[model samples]
Target chain A: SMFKLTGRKALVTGATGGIGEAIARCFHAQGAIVGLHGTREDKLKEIAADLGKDVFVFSANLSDRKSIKQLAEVAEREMEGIDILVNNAGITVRMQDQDWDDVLAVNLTAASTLTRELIHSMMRRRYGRIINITSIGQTNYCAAKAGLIGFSKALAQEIASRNITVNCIAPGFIKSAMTDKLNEKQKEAIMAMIPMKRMGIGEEIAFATVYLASDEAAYLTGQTLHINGGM
Target chain B: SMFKLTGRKALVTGATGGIGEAIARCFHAQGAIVGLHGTREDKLKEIAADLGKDVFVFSANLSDRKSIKQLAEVAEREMEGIDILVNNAGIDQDWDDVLAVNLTAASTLTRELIHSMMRRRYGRIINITSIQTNYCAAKAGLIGFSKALAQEIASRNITVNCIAPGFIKMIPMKRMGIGEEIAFATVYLASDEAAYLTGQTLHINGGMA
Candidate 1:
């Protein structure tokens, strides 16, 4: 009956900026012990200050698999045990060829690798929640993203018997520093295509992340909740 | 582009009665070579005789795995390579156990027959699924059957889809029997129109499926 995360611990990657930072703040506000992970120690320190002493900072270059492993180890040592893992760290370079490898390595592979590492301890407790942040363009992001869907579906089936849930969230274009770079006409074209006739706010995605992280979405697993204003 | 199945070869299972016969007759009228398969050889032969020689009849119990393999072999021989394979041959033994005909023997084994068509590369497989697949406690027959099958054949280019028809309008409450809207949707899916669609369940119920 209780949806609160009063004594739970949450670890969010790429928490230095944009969507990841918003999710960190949201989880902290909901009474969870928050761990902010990013490569930038300075930015992590800045966000950690605003989140007070309960928000711990771990700096690791997520581009390298070894670095991500070290980050997970350090986080587990600091937070005792991570109950929730938000794999929100991702990068999308617009260049056709260069973007493909970089995006797949960071966006899909790192998140999946980190999730696999954390799943052992999560399964031991007999309770866990994994929220994967995937994009609508994941099919074009190489076999990794498509494999993520197949992987999550198989993993969901495997862990459902253990009372653990695995899910994905595909967010549409939203208003951010990323979108602010687009001119008025470009913004209008994007907004016109959306059924809601506007871009989503970062807080909207944060709220959905928090909801899935909570106990309310217990029945929901092996599914993708699309937050694209019905686009 | 023409989505019609004119001059194509189609094989419908459980064509002796109910929705299967309707699908076979509809496709026959559409100018396709229709193969009728069911356990009832007399009914199948009667329906085929009425439809003339373009329709062939084959008998195989889909519940038996060995018989299903034989069904695939005979279907391949008679039709000379089926362009469309409608997996409409399913039986629901009215029982509470989830492992009844609807779930294990019928739905699961039918999907396993994909080995024959997947090798051909050009095939349209339509599964005649019921609306009860989604309703948790409606009946234990179809809920798990359709979902598990849909997931199994998703990646194969040879599309595997389902049609869930809700209560039809104008049908008498007591004499309504099993609906036929799923039959029509099966026709559309077998047609060339649904090319990019695979692993999808079309709910054709008046509004429910």
Candidate 2:
């Protein structure tokens, strides 16, 4: 019970990826009811079956506003409440108006729109934890994520009186199928730059997300906890 | 708090370096024993006296491959095994020195001592890289090496991560970051709270890119 979230409800987007899946599983393990979100139906079904926290599953193309809105409605209908909102769903769409539009659509605008939709109830109850996951990848990725940090800070203060907290967890190089396949020279070069001399995994990011979600972190708000292993 | 490193053993290099000294001090505050490595034995001696944990001193040319394995032995034998390693130092090097010390020594020592870590199934390796743009290959290579190794021993509970400081400013305080800012971040990574944390670089530069 070091950091339990029993009775709390959560909605996690992009649960198909390494970090998002971890956050979902961690929340479920901590006794929180979880509503899973992702574009992949199979992956969504797999996690729902595995986690057993099943508040509901709402699949959507986050880049589309209509789909995003539908996702919000489904979460509200099924979960009854969302005590924690993790804006983890994002894309690395760079270059061209089309790419930037999709990038902002899912990574930034969707999160803001969704938060605006879901936050007032928490304001009424005067308790909430909003966690956003940013990255250190493509130029657009960094740009949108930086916007999230700013958003978390500003919204955190705006909602501070309402007993809500907003925070960001920016992950550095993380291990996945993608990285495990990297060549030694490729791997060695990146490792040389890290102080901890290692890349991070999904579980590490999960533990951090769990901490921010728990009651113990209430005093901590508007802060960006960089969980990258000392990038 | 998850910051405590009680009963843990540490080997921090570059003790004369601000961050190396800072981590040594920070780790000592949390109750871990230390085996500090740096060329400037006198400075480390002064540092060790203040920071307890029965701090031991190590001197070797980190850039020299032959010395790295030997150096690893002396420390491993004396301390029995190294639980935490802060690869945090390299002098203003010529390009080759940067390649040798910054890139080579860190990994060679890691490979040599990993046996103890895997056997115990507990380790925390914190590589201290910087944003120095000049001859970026060595430092950048360290990051990749750290990431790959983190994947190697992750399931055994040995965590390898990196800390790269950007500037001199602390977040929230809205002021410039100092040694303590970097030290606190290192402490968190070294502790058990970060057990699941590996294969990643923590960019603690007051949000600076």
Candidate 3:
């Protein structure tokens, strides 16, 4: 109940689909002025139109630094400086070298670069909340997610004195279209690892994001909160 | 940073020492109206004074069910229904008391609180699970209990979670862990930061298991 975020400017990356969209919707529902970013301009416009005309939309191919910088400048200019940054943009790729670089580009380097783009403003404002949405998966995804944890903790301490708190939420085996396509055998293999005998939904992750972004969590910083159902 | 609990009411069990004392202190610091429960009067009264008189202190013997009930009523009456419930009260007594205190009391009290929690369409239930070496069976069952219960009411906006802490030097052992270390997990889990985190177990051990 203490999770409302009125008058807050938020920039949620990967806002076109899945968990990213869910986080944007939840942030918007909490009264935050949301800035939506994704690789697909068409999808971003569709979501923005549905959300309302006042919501901001931007195009950013996270692998490219220029696109990231442009989006950041636009967001800061339009939203009047983001008070909440949801680093929910992420992609999982094969462990091969080429795909690995792509994965690192979006999930790791871009995460670092984007936070750098906004942290100074957040510090000057003396208030900010950063929630990195990570996942439990193989090689590339797991490495990027784990790296986000390290980065978030390190930055959290550096910015703690400035009234900004940074944290990570690692979701495990959340229900998605991919899970829905799994065979019975596959389902059994995955579900067996989860004690709750089910997969988590995007809404669950969104709610966690709102909580980490709210004022109620002001004293909390430098923590990795795991949302896996006892894996 | 969503770890505040201002204007919120919380009931913490086993507030005498170890993890419980840590939770009580941290929750109070978060601006919550705290109700502390313990078995020892001296420790309870001492912590109550340290926490100030605005906080309520209640005592109960784990072996007695009625004593547990009385403490719950006092907390509900004083705090006006708990928004957060921490089943951190527990001990390594004989088998009977172990099961009663660690597993039974937690769920029974939770059932009572869940009624009020559902009415508000919001609640947080944090069960402090113990090590695998001692009280392993009861601890395991407590976990199983949390999952079933978490699913039952998550739709009602009530969350049930667990903080299973690893062996710490805090309780006169080897390795490391302060009460504050475990308290931080409880604070995160009990706060709204953990709203979608029902039926989850957060391990705060030394990055091991």
Candidate 4:
């Protein structure tokens, strides 16, 4: 009850993924009506069905500007208004103009575009919480994540007076597609570097998200919670 | 046991101050053999005596360069070589003393004790940083020092980090951070749990930064 989000509406991108889905579930559990966005319609529908009520599902390829724009419009329409926005979608292209472009677009640009579109509604309502999910990754991915941090700081300063707090949650290594593919040797190498000597859980990151999205964290903005088990 | 310090020896500067005392208490509770450093001997002795055992007290003017060296020597000798060194003693100094106490003293003390830590192949150095102007330069320099030193000693199994706290009145939390908040973070960074967490600044401010 401390961080209850009752009557609040949240839109979390990449909601089909492990971490994203965890955050969406936690947000809803905390009493927020959630808008689930992802590329997999079936998974989104599955999650929506499971949540049973106060949940909306939207599908979009974040790499496309128009798709992002449309997703924002529809999400806003369905949710009435979004009180919290979680930019959880991201990707890696290995490396290339096409690859890096899509990486940056989905990882960084889409978050900005959606926030730009919906922030005004927040400003009018005089309440908002923007949580950008950043992680350590490839050159382009790292660049995008770092940029997101800077973006969150600047935007937080600009909107602090409106009661909208912007912050970031940078997860250490957790169970994900990337970590799932690592060999035992690779895993051992990483484990040696981590003081906690283990990977984090999606629920761990989700719990932090729930706190950041709640009213209790209004004084916290332009900050990144590094929940990496001491990595 | 996640963040327990058990047998680790720790020297926390500014031990008489609110924040520094909190850190010392927390470290002691977590099982570290603590060295309490402060300008006020009475306060330091009081805290040390209350802890009763596995604790030592040293008093010095950190702004005095030689005093810093002396403090380091006395602390290292008393503790049988410190495993965790907390450079928490600081003053809202005038231009010269500010840099000396806030920045240079930390560097000087770390210089003296770092070798012991490196030789032992285990260490945690936490520099306490706060908000200010000249204080800003000193604090910022402390951060830079921490980052550079963290990298230098990282492979040696030693980690260096900083905690930057903001002013109370301006913070979003609408209150000053309790000593335990900062102290808990200090415990984390000092513990084996934070071995991979280095060359970073943990802002304990109420989201002002």
Candidate 5:
């Protein structure tokens, strides 16, 4: 069966680049109206221009809780209430921070807060899909990422009766701009560790996201799909 | 492919009744030296007599951590070494005190016995699971039991797993028993054929718990 999202509206966070951009494009390709979210106005504008009017853009610094709330409000206003929310915005501060607050703020807390807000609206409609883009290093990312797993599972149970589904996609090292930063030796070491001996493509992650956002994945919830090529 | 458990020594807790008994019989019929574990001496002895010397009986209360440790020690001592451990010894204390027998004791304490096998570098551990795992309203009995144990021993090569059997009717159709599909799948996991399979749960139901 074809996964058609012709009349559905999808809010894709961090849609200007990387995995988020791929997910936005995938959903749009499936006939969905995508609300593109990013902090960079220029990047968002470029993406909106490429995807046309069916794709709307909103600039919000997801690290800020207020900005996250504003983003949700703007998304609902422009897109008329999201049927699917792709919580794809994430950041990895490699250097140990003096405060470690930004990592917690953007990657975990903001995603959870935005999800809670959107889930409230979703419950009112009695139909919604929430896909949280979590990581294998979730526990390592900050306590918040680890907490996201607990939150997603708890929220999935809380909303299952309402016909809403919440799931997490923990992508292993996928081919992205981030992977370009690594040297061949480093890349080889990472690849060698994985059972499949290769990095996952962003398209694969996007495809999985689309499936979860589709009616086909209606029965699947409160679970995490590890797309690390068997890692 | 046929799942053959020939030459493997398997310890099945709560093997005197219900699902445990069926699993023990299935493993025995597949050629495993089955160790029937339960508190009832008479029933264990009877089953042992029927299944012959290839099936031994070990009695211990799995809820008690010390007793479980002793059970493991005695099993390893008597059977030479346990190649597979079926933590099927479980009780449904229901909801009010769900944390005691179902969650903590069955999931945590029972799995801890695998630490002994972990040091030896090889083991096939399976927790007899229920279809109620994914549903929250279905009571915390099986859900908490399987998930906690699965997570605890994934890193060790010991391969801690679970088999979630759905509703199966008895042969006479008088009542529903554990699904035969689930029993066959569990036998596959415990078989020598599944050496690479570990730290996962196999769901075999008629589309529902």
Candidate 6:
């Protein structure tokens, strides 16, 4: 029963990736009624089916404001209210203006816009846990991730009186589609720079997310927890 | 309240290592019986005396495989069971010896002691690695081996992980991490709270990675 979240409602974006899916699963296990959000409906539906009950799924392209607003409205309506919000969906690009803009929108701006839509109800309810997953990246990716940290801190202070806590979890060298594409030599080169010399798993990041989303972590806010092997 | 380790028994190698004493102190504070291992019996006794309760010390050279094996046996015998095993004893350079003490010694101890954990269906194994420019291979091998072993024994409820420390300037915190920082992490991994955190490495380099 440690760190339990019974009866709480949680909305997690980017539920398709390993990290986001892990976060969703952990939240569901902690007894929260969860709303899963992602662009990949197939994977998203798969997760929803796996959870079976106390779950709702939403698909939205974060690059567009209308879609982001629609996702927030639907989740708020469906879940009754959100006690915890995990902004985990993100994208990386190969330095194109088009790609970089989408990265900023999805990784940074989308979180803010979504929070803007959801914050009013959370403030009225006077209970919330906002966890932003920043990367541990390309220059554009790094900038967006760094931006989220600042945003989280400022928002945390602003909402402190409302009993809402905001925090960031920055992961280092996590295994994903991006990493899986790398050959052994490339992986070895990256591993050599890391002291622990291993890439972290989705569950590792998921556990931290669960901690942040729990009642036990209510006193903790405006901080970033780095879950990376020694770099 | 979440990270309690009351009544648990832990064996931390490298009593003389910079962070070993801190880990022992933290584990004791969390209500665990701690066995300190190091080459320096003098310092070991000093730490055990300082802790003043629920602490024991053993002396052995990590460079010798048989010596490492003996330490494990003695630890298991005296402690009755080791709920947590931290392989923090490591020496830099000397090539083969570095590999011997850093990698081989850890594997030897885990091999010798993992059975009790399997029987009890509980264990937390943490390997401490460093940023040695010359001995990166040994440390790298330790992580790969740690992950492999983590998978091998995970079904038995034994979790294996690593911690690596580095310089301050390279870190985002811009200050060298203290022994207590690393020990705090050890306490987390050692506690029941970290059961889902096997096969991972926690870098205590103040955000270097």
- Candidate 3: tens digits of C-alpha lDDT, residues A1-231: 479988899999989988999988888889889999988999998888888845899887787887888888889998888998888888754534456446556776677678878989999989999888875424445445554665677677788999999988889888888888999899999999999988889889899989999999999887877888887
Candidate 1 residue lDDT tens string, B1-209: 35567867887888988788888887887778998988999999999988896888998876665687677777778787777777666541232232233333444345445666667655676766433221221122233333444455555556666665555334333333344555667778887778777766776644431
Better of 4 and 5 by lDDT: 4
TM-score against truth, every candidate: 0.54, 0.52, 0.52, 0.54, 0.53, 0.52
- DockQ (Cα-based) per candidate? 0.03, 0.01, 0.01, 0.02, 0.02, 0.01
Native contact recovery (fnat) for each candidate is: 0.00, 0.00, 0.00, 0.00, 0.00, 0.00
Higher-scoring candidate on lDDT, 3 or 5: 3
What's the lDDT of the predicted structure labeled candidate 5? 0.72
Interface RMSD of each: 14.0, 12.5, 14.8, 10.8, 10.1, 15.7
Residue lDDT tens for model 5, B1-209: 47888878888887887778888888888898888889999999988887786878888876665687677778877887788877666551242133233333444434445666677766787777433221221223333334444455556656656776656542233444464455577788877577677656676554453
lDDT, each prediction: 0.70, 0.79, 0.80, 0.83, 0.72, 0.83
Per-residue lDDT over B79-193 for candidate 2, one digit per residue giving the tens place of the 0 to 100 score: 8778998888775235346556665577777878888899999899999885422224455557766776777788889988988877652355465668877889889999998
Provide backbone clash counts, one per model: 2, 51, 7, 0, 0, 1
lDDT of 2 by residue, A164-209 (tens): 8989898888898888989999999989878899998899999999
List model 6 lDDT by residue over B67-142, tens digit each: 8778888999999899999998886125446556666677678878898999999999999886422255456556
Q: For each candidate, C-alpha RMSD in Å?
A: 11.4, 17.1, 19.9, 14.5, 10.0, 19.1
Cα lDDT tens digits, model 3, B87-141, are 9888713544655666667766776678889999999999997652125535655
In model 3, the runs with Cα more than 4 Å from the true position are: A93-95, B1-209
User: What does DockQ come to for candidate 6?
Assistant: 0.01
lDDT value, residue A37 of candidate 4: 95
| Candidate 5 off by > 4 Å | A93-99, A136-139, B1-209
Q: Which has the better TM-score: candidate 5, or candidate 6?
A: 5
Better of 1 and 2 by lDDT: 2
